Amino acid sequence: GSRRYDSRTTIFSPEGRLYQVEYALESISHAGTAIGIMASDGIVLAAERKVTSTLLEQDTSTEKLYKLNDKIAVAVAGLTADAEILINTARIHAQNYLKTYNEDIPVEILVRRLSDIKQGYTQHGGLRPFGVSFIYAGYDDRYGYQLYTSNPSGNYTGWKAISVGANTSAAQTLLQMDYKDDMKVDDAIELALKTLSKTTDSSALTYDRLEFATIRKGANDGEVYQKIFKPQEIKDILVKTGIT
Amino acid sequence: DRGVSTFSPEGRLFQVEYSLEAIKLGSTAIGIATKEGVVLGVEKRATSPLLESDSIEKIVEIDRHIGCAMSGLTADARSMIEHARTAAVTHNLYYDEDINVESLTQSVCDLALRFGEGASGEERLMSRPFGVALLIAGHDADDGYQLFHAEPSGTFYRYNAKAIGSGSEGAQAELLNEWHSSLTLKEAELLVLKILKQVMEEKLDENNAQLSCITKQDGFKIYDNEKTAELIKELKEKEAAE
Amino acid sequence: TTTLAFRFQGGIIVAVDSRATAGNWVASQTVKKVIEINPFLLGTMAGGAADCQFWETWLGSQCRLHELREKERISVAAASKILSNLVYQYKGAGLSMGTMICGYTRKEGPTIYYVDSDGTRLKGDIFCVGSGQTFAYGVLDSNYKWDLSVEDALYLGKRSILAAAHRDAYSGGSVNLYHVTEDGWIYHGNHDVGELFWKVKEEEGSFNNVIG
Amino acid sequence: MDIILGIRVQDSVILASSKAVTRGISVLKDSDDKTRQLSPHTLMSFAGEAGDTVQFAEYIQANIQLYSIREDYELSPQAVSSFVRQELAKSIRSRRPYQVNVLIGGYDKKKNKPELYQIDYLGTKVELPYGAHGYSGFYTFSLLDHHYRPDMTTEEGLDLLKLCVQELEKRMPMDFKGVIVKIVDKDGIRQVDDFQAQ
Amino acid sequence: FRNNYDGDTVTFSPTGRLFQVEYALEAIKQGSVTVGLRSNTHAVLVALKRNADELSSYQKKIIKCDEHMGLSLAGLAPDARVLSNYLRQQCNYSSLVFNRKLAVERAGHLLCDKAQKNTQSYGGRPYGVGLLIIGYDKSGAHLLEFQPSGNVTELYGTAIGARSQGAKTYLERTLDTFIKIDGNPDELIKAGVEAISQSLRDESLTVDNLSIAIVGKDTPFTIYDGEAVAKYI
Amino acid sequence: GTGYDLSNSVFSPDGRNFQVEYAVKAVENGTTSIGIKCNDGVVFAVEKLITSKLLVPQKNVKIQVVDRHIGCVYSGLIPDGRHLVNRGREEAASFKKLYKTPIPIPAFADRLGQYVQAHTLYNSVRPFGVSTIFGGVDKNGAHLYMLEPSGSYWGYKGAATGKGRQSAKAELEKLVDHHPEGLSAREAVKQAAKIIYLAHEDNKEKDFELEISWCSLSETNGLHKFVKGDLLQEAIDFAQKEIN
Amino acid sequence: MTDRYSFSLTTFSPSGKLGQIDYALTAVKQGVTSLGIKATNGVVIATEKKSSSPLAMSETLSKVSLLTPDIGAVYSGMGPDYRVLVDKSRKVAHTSYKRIYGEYPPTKLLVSEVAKIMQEATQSGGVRPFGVSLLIAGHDEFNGFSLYQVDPSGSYFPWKATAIGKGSVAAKTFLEKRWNDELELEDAIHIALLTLKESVEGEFNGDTIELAIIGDENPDLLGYTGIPTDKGPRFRKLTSQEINDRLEAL
Amino acid sequence: GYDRALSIFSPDGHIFQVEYALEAVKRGTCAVGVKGKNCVVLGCERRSTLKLQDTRITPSKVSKIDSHVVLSFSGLNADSRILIEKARVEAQSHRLTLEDPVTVEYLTRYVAGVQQRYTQSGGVRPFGVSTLIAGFDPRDDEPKLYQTEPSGIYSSWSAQTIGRNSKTVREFLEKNYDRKEPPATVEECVKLTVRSLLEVVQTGAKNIEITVVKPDSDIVALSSEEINQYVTQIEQEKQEQ
């Protein structure tokens, strides 16, 4: 029969580890670094575009920052395609919740559902896990600003600042070094850019190799605003923070 | 790899055999059938002094005239007992009478070989055999008191006495000598209690061992600690007596 | 059918008739409209014979499994809800049964539950179910006191079913009595209306209409 | 039908529900509580088809409770009613719909305002100062359309109800055996055990 | 070799063998012995019941499929149950639908076809049991030998199991003798017990150890055990 | 590498399907059987090894009929042969039911053809362990066919398979040459009995039992019937005579 | 029978690689070169018609396919996989978009659809990834002209110009030199023809080349008249003739 | 369509996948539970491989199945959610049909069966999780503490622990818990719990969380301080000698 070619993707190693998850994570480790820093007045999401070219259309591009809801967005690290599959089903869950309760879906609720889907490919079905790790940046009237992270295993946790993808250990140390509870969005924006700048496997940290987004509650309003910086906007903020 | 329902060159089913190995590592269980009832006793075998010994349920009631003891992967026995209980009650609903001890056993054994990955015969959706063996003891108007040994092989045997689990081959030999067609219930109780004492690693007391029986008059009952403790005492005495 | 069950100081009384019809044809005057689920659980039957008999017998099997599974007597509340939920699954299919589930668990004490094929499940102290429920209610309602002797309660019951057996063309035969204490139910015999009527008439002076 | 009334005052929501349960020619019970507590601050009254009534109520109760434990949070009255409407709206187009009409009254601890929702078995939802299901509405809407003020106290609300219940006892053909009243405010749900003569 | 072609039934060896089927057959041999022989008026099944301990029973080896048919098992008990049961339905069906008793020859074809299915599809395992079917139909007495391979044969007499080779030679000799035990049941049976003992060695056929079944002209398939066979030991 | 012979639908480097070839082995290892096409019908005959004196003579039949005009005989794993006939039988009923007319021999051939070929497409099934010779008379003549485990089949004047397929084929070839005008049903029946006797030499160790059947537009009215009694003996002798 | 291959044929190796995706890419690397350049008023995609025999008719084999009237695709890798992809793409353009909104899908979404299909052949049970890389060029009212590349992994990215297949590296470099955000469609067509010449060993003419554009609307290719709003398809395949004419100005 | 038998027997009679599931439990952070005379306490340790989390929203280790029952575990987090969910649903279903909340043994028996089931079903691996389920049966005051494991086995403990170094801390409890006189107080019960955790947590004020369950759905978790106060007083028990 076919049992001969079955990799048994959902089994335990003698050490009680899930081969595929571990290898999926190994894959994630070579993905462009993504950073999420949560301040008092907002959340910041910054990501490094893995591989680019002169000819690459950065205007129409998106490979790391996706909008899930109007109050929730994610930073991707891993297989873009895999990420999109989960992004879309994630977007649906949000809408079902809305249509059912006439209220936007609480950030954790959405994160758990998506993580549960992942955990599934971990325990049954004989299919490979998704090679994706997410940093969720959202806001809800119960916990306000929230930052989460999920990976191939289906495990998820909340952070003040966090990184995924390549050189996370380095980036985490640098973040754990300059983060301060009372921070401010603009501060985090800078902390974020610096961190990436010191962990990049590239020469310099130029705008064309970045994706930036912030979730603020614009004082002159009273509601939440998601802003996904445009090439030009990134180039500016890049110079200002002193990286020209 | 190799089919979960494959045959060894010696004409045996690997999974069923390996299944038996697991049962050998199980806690001892003994059954004695007499013309005054059948006795079932088991070794609790708590793994730590903190474990509340009476939360260990290795002897269960199928119906008022049928009870059973298990040995091996006891978690596997839950669905078996469930199936058994249902079969008993169901039979009663359809026929207004008690399910014959043999029939009940036959029914449980029917689940035995229902395992595989696509075994062409029905819809045997179970990944592996059961890792437990059962001693089904009961009574019915047609064949009186009976003791049965139900294995993961699907086959079941009837015994006058039988021991399964870690100290089985040992205890089995004991039963060979000790058993006679005119044992009294009390004799059989002590007997089981004695044989458990030999095979058990721990010193047998009314806490790491449990007795029970089934008699036409009051059906299946599980002896509460006090009742057993005294039989323990009564045994030490008859032994010291020579 | 006429059946009743009521709670009082001395527990629960349960009385039923024993007549079975098919149109105007009196098919039987010797029917057991009470099923003893177990030592402390009684179920009464009003409506369609097959429906009640079958499903209540089935209820019994369900109660047994609960006890084997949980090693404890099933509550009167849960026993009734099982029948109720089952009957509800068939809602609209035509099942016809007006049931009463009486018992005595230490946790609920004396308890009576009304359960019918509409899916209605009600807890109460007094209930009369059947083509003759109104006749029973008339007699029962006007002589009920929480403080009745187990002897009087028993009589009132018997007398109420008698009442119905007289006026309701679809009720009659004999009266079957039961008493529920926390020591279980206690059968209190079968009383043929053929003789019970005259006796009660004489000894009571009621049924003052009929010429005897 | 049965009597199902709801009235939202200043800081609470009051629900009045008839106590009779009649089948055929007999009034089987006169102390029926045609209500279920969905959450600490949300109460739902219901009326309609014999079986569907409680089955639905309890089914909804179970779901809300499960949500509460899963999220360790109490859904807002608005959210709960949206959930219930969707349920009924699914039912109406199923093999055998639930023939149940409900009133959902709750106290929104986040907005600190009571809310009253009327939803019929078709999945028709609407929020109101006061509402009712069945024939009752035919007497009580104009009654309240007259004697109702938004700033009324819970006490003024109960007098307003009494006024309704009296009008219903006077003109309605059926004997509904009085009502059971319950108050939903910032401190949960409590039942006025003294309405049989308040 | 073999080791690489015995993983499952769906695999053929380079020589054309189905090892899994073969290993199944091997379970028959490990099984207790049983014998069947028929005259022109009757057919008899003499089976040696095997016991685990001296405290255990001698597991029943004769199953009745219908008033006119029955069989003896050598190998995995569960599989015999499955197969006997299937045969019981086929017999039942034939009666209910056509009001006709099932031809023993046809019961054989049904068994072969059912076994064959578990030897050509992935996942399944062959049946690990041998069967001897006896019966009286519209063409007299009949005896069938069923092999898990799917091969079913009609004989005058035969045996399967451990040391079964003894009884089989004896009957291949006694042939002309028992084949004429017409009208006399006790003789055909005795003739059988004398064939089954030709495969003993360990012990001698006791009372609670011998099992005989018979069917014929005016004998509805019936099974005798214990006291009932005492007069044959 | 190797191992191309462990899974049924696999192609070996030289484009073969080893599992099918191994099936053939099982066939060659079986009893011999043949088929002779004559001027208005066909004859089938097969060897029946008498394993013992216990085998009730004439009972254990092998040749099978499909519908009322098709005769089938096979060498190899008998159970597999029955399976193939059961199918053919349904295949035939289905055809008749829709078209009224009983299934043409060629049409029937492809039915078995396609079905057998089917068992060489997936690794979840085993190929057929039999070669089958079948045929009959239809709207236009008599047709003789032989089907291989590969599902391959062709029309034959004479055909044989099993242990002594060579002896047989040898004989058959003689007949074809010494009878360019066409053999007769009566003739073929004897000729067949002979060829089985000759071809029995490659197994001369065990005693056998002859079995013949035929379908002749004149001798059987186009229906498949078994050769019994007198006509059987007459042919048994015709062989017994020329075997010496 | 029954597909008993219900498990993934593409899995993560200890190193973190997804072998089959890699190998699929290797397959693409071997494929004939193909490219695409985006001008300010059009897009051009082209490749080589590597006839597999002089007896074969190269026309009966288009490597450049129209998905919607404003979207065309070309590839590099395993032709057959491409063919079925174009079919699925053409259909999904209807089922998931036209049949819902009454208008053809914008380039990015259709590409997103194709990418989805490919992603699944990377995870679904019992299948191998697609052995192709596509270059899809189109135009939609709110996004203008666009060019995308879709890989076996299911990943896709927008380009100003790029090439895939055999001499992609070399060709990509040649493009970076000649591209600018002011190129006119003809300028790109020219540049396209130049870049392609380096990747061709033999004959380089309108019969050995396949080139199509996404430019202005062709009311002449609409097939009917009478509806002002309907102006014609923006996708047009250049004729063997129209190519040669530009080759003489090469 | 995927039904490969992943949990099967090996020659020695072991189901390696279930075995390896336990290895995943050994790896998980530690968890412990000790029952008092009128309560039950559940303590768990907090990893520190990465510290910079947001304690407010990061999922806590002790979960409520119903208002009167809690479940803590050691092993794969993802896996536990699946079990918690099922337990919670069964909890509501049981109330809905029996008109009475589940008993701790019942809820435990249910969770255990789900686990057992995943050990002999095709295409699925066992739960790399072991649990401690505790609470008070409806209208009862006698505390209940149970534990389950990948195999599907389950039983009650006077006190028990699972997870890394559970070995160590079990010893502590074996020679620190007298069934004769169980922690007659919520306070001395919570102390016995932290003491046992300190044996392994190695000074972790923020690396230790305790939850206290009393009769009648009275459940509450302690804050850093309240716990830290227990740590402080305990370290003095040591130094004062």
Ligand SMILES: *C[C@](*)(O)[C@H](Cc1ccc(O)cc1)NC(=O)[C@H](CC(C)C)NC(=O)[C@H](CC(C)C)NC(=O)OCc1ccccc1
């Ligand atoms: C008066 C009570 O309803 C009584 C309850 C009962 C319970 C158990 C048993 O075994 C008998 C009776 N049932 C009946 O009187 C009921 C008549 C009315 C619906 C009350 N009768 C039937 O259920 C009848 C009983 C048979 C004689 C067993 N079964 C039925 O098929 O009758 C329908 C009918 C057919 C034709 C003409 C009119 C009615």
